[PDB]
Structure formats: C-alpha cells, structure tokens
Paper text:
Dihydroflavonol 4-reductase (DFR) and flavanone 4-reductase (FNR) reduce dihydroflavonols and flavanones, respectively, using NAD(P)H to produce flavan-(3)-4-(di)ols in flavonoid biosynthesis. Anthocyanidin reductase (ANR) reduces anthocyanidins to flavan-3-ols. In addition to their sequences, the 3D structures of recombinant DFR, FNR and ANR from sorghum and switchgrass showed a high level of similarity. The catalytic mechanism, substrate-specificity and key residues of three reductases were deduced from crystal structures, site-directed mutagenesis, molecular docking, kinetics, and thermodynamic ana-lyses.
The structure of PvDFRa reveals thirteen α-helices and ten β-strands. Its Rossman fold domain, an NAD(P)H-binding signature, consisted of seven parallel β-strands (β1–β7) with both sides surrounded by eight α-helices (α1–α8). In particular, the existence of two α-helices (α7 and α8) between the β6 and β7 establish its overall topology of βαβαβαβαβαβααβα, closely resembling those of extended short-chain dehydrogenases/reductases (SDR). Calculations through PDBePISA, which evaluates interactions between neighboring molecules in crystal lattices for the purpose of predicting biologically relevant oligomeric states, indicated that the Gibbs free energy of the binding interface (ΔiG) of 0.3 kcal·mol−1 between protein molecules, reflecting PvDFRa likely exists as a monomer in vivo. Despite a lack of cofactor in the crystallization buffer, an NADP+ molecule was present in the crystal structure of PvDFRa. From the early stages of refinement, a difference (Fo–Fc) electron density map clearly indicated the presence of an NADP+ molecule in the binding pocket of PvDFRa, SbFNR1, and SbFNR2 with its nicotinamide moiety properly positioned for the pro-R hydride transfer towards the catalytic site. The bound nicotinamide ring in PvDFRa, SbFNR1, and SbFNR2 established a syn-conformation, whereas the adenine ring adopted an anti-conformation. In our experiment, the NADP+-binding affinity of PvDFRa was roughly 100 times greater than its affinity for DHQ, and the structure of PvDFRa contained NADP+ in its active site even without added NADP+ in the crystallization buffer, which was not the case for the purified SbFNR1 and SbFNR2. These facts support the previous hypothesis that a non-productive NADP+ binary complex could limit the ability of the enzyme to replace NADP+ with NADPH as an abortive DFR complex with NADP+ or a dihydroflavonol can inhibit the association of NADPH. The dissociation constants for NADP+, DHK, DHQ, DHM, naringenin, and eriodictyol were 184.6 nM, 18.65 µM, 16.87 µM, 21.23 µM, 176.9 µM, and 64.94 µM, res-pectively.
Residue numbers in the entry: 17 to 343
Write the structure that this text describes.
C-alpha cells in the first residue's frame, strides 16, 4: 500500500499539531512535519517517536516570518494543514508584532501552496474567537458568524490581539483562495482538550482545569465555554480534507456549557478534587450556554466520538503524570 500523498503539518511540535501528525500517520499518510528548529531535539523527539514516523515522517525547518521557508516542504504535497500561529500576546505593538505577522504568515503559506501546483486542498485551523467575539453575544453561532474586529480593537478585552489575528487571517486565507481558485477548508475549534505529548501543560488545559486548580484569571473564559476533544478535532480535519464535497468554514465543537454546569460535572465526577461553589469575577446570575453549531460538519457524515467526560478523563490523567496535583 502506497502512502497517501505527502501532506504538511505546520507547527507540528505543538499541542494540536503533534496529535494531528500522529493521526495522519495512523491513516496512512506520509507526513512532512514543519518546526521552527528541527535541531531542538527536545521538541522534535516526541514526533520521531510516533507510530509509523520512522517510515513516513520527515521533519522540516520553516518559519512563518521567513518568506519561502515552506516552499521546499510543500513542494510535491497534495495537502497542507496550517496549524502554526504566533502566540506571543504580550507585546507593545500588537498590530505589527502579532496581527500583521499572523496574516502575512497565512498568506505566504497560501502563496507557497499555489506555487507548488501539487496541493489540491488547504486546511486552515481557525478558532472560535474568529466567530463570536462581538458586543452582543448570540445564543447560537455557526460558520457564518464573524468576530467584530473593530469591537476588539475598541474595548481590547484580554486576548484581543489573538481574536483579531485569527479573524483577519481566516478572512484573508479565504479571500486569497477564492481569488486564485484554491480549495481551502477553515476549521473552527473551541477550547481543545485531550492528551498532550509535550512536557508542559497546553495553554488550553490551563483554562480547562482552572476549576480543579485555582487558576482564577481563566474563570471568565469558562463562564460560557465550548469544548472539543483533541482527537475529534484532528479526525474532523482529516475527514474534511478527504471528503470531496467539503468546502468553506466548518465549526468543530462538540459541547457547550457554563462555568456553573462544568463545576457541577467535576463535583459529581471527581469527589477527589475540591470544586468551589462560587468563582471570583463571576456573579451568581443566570448563565445559559452559548452553542456552536457543528451541523455543517455533521451533515457531511462526521460524528464526534468523545464526551466532555472523556476529555477531562484524558487531560487529568496525562497532567497527573506531571503538572497537576492528584489531590
Ligand atoms: N489548543 C486550543 O484550544 C485551540 C483552540 C482554538 C484554536 N486553536 C488553534 O490551533 C492551532 C494550534 O494551537 P495550539 O493549541 O497547538 O498552541 P501551540 O501548542 O503553542 O502550537 C502552535 C505552534 O505554532 C508554532 N509557531 C508559532 N510561531 C511560529 C512561527 N513564526 N513559525 C512556525 N511556527 C510557529 C509553535 O512552534 P514553537 O514551539 O517554535 O513556538 C507552535 O508549535 C492555532 O492556530 C490555534 O489558534 C487552538
């Protein structure tokens, strides 16, 4: 059996990327994993240790701020999964140090894909922050809703530079694709929870586990939150790449709840962990869930495998093997 056309995974050393490499290898693909520094044995070793990596995984050096650095890796590939994004949201010129670099990085990826000629489809990983960051929160969001970038630059909530970065990059990738007749899929995941291979806690699990720990600054994120299992997300990205009828934006969210609802589930499911009853910065009002509809993805025939219980069972375990207390 011949390896499925070589596909690139950008940011392969990361939380989402590394697991996507695992799943693409398992599905019979030759995977070209790109990282900013393949000489960093620490970050590269987990990838090379993956099942099937010896035969079908290769590591490539590339940087989103370095025009053309992805040309060699993409050349000859049938698909590109763009998961990398700049994550340094603590600068003093976010427009020029985060926003523009994020949009120029995605556009340069698209250019390299066009030049290659061999790429039939690009799968861009967006974020829920490109959908529902507006002044008036709606009860249901789908792939047709777009964050209000003007609103973000006005009130500058926590993480505003990231919402505008991804929202503008998402819009720019689509516009470039349509202008040059390219096949682009944009996948919108909420907070992603699941196993990780890095020795450090993924930033999404710091939020997900903020109730078990005492990570109070993350409480506002859990106020009205949506979840997806990392495995479901990666499987959906492979599904959407292989389905000939797939096109456009897709929401990949399997669970919506509130901080109060999440506290209850962890209370009944983990008596071993002390779950508070009240959370600073969050009143005792009426909180209803905000739903991210994945109808478009499910209509194509995709099905989620994991529940929110599966997610937290997997996160607590991997973390328990290091960065969190067993309490
Ligand atoms: N995890 C979630 O909950 C979540 C939710 C919604 C959307 N997403 C999106 O999923 C994608 C993955 O994020 P993540 O959770 O996996 O964070 P992450 O663990 O930090 O991985 C992201 C990758 O981006 C790479 N990167 C940053 N700047 C780069 C550059 N100039 N050139 C090449 N690579 C660069 C990082 O490599 P280095 O080690 O060299 O910095 C890093 O491996 C992002 O696009 C994110 O917006 C994630």
């Amino acid at each position: 059996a011949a390896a499925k056309g070589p596909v690139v995974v950008t940011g392969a050393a990361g939380f989402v990327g590394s697991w996507l490499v695992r799943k693409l290898l398992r599905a019979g693909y030759a995977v070209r994993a790109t990282v900013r520094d393949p000489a960093n044995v620490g970050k590269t070793k987990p990838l090379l240790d993956l099942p099937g990596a010896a035969e079908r995984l290769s590591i490539w050096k590339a940087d989103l701020t370095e025009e053309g650095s992805f040309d060699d890796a993409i050349k000859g590939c049938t698909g590109v999964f763009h998961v990398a994004t700049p994550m340094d949201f603590e600068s003093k010129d976010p427009e020029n140090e985060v926003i523009k670099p994020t949009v120029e990085g995605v556009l340069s990826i698209m250019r390299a894909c066009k030049e290659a000629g061999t790429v039939r489809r690009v799968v861009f990983t967006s974020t829920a922050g490109a959908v529902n960051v507006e002044e008036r929160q709606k009860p249901v969001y789908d792939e047709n809703n777009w964050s209000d970038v003007d609103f973000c630059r006005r009130v500058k909530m926590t993480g505003w530079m990231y919402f505008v970065s991804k929202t503008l990059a998402d819009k720019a990738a689509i516009a470039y694709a349509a202008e040059h007749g390219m096949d682009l899929i944009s996948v919108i995941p909420p907070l992603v929870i699941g196993p990780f291979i890095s020795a450090g806690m993924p930033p999404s699990l710091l939020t997900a586990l903020a109730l078990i720990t005492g990570n109070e600054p993350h409480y506002s994120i859990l106020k009205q939150v949506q979840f997806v299992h990392l495995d479901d997300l990666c499987d959906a990205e492979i599904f959407l790449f292989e389905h000939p009828a797939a096109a456009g934006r897709y929401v990949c969210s399997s669970h919506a709840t509130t901080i109060h609802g999440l506290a209850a589930m962890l209370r009944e499911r983990y008596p071993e962990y002390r779950i508070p009853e009240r959370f600073r910065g969050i009143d005792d009002g009426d909180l209803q869930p905000v739903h991210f509809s994945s109808k478009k993805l499910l209509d194509l025939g995709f099905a989620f495998k994991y529940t929110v219980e599966d997610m937290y069972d997997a996160a607590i375990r991997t973390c328990r093997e290091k960065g969190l207390i067993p309490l």
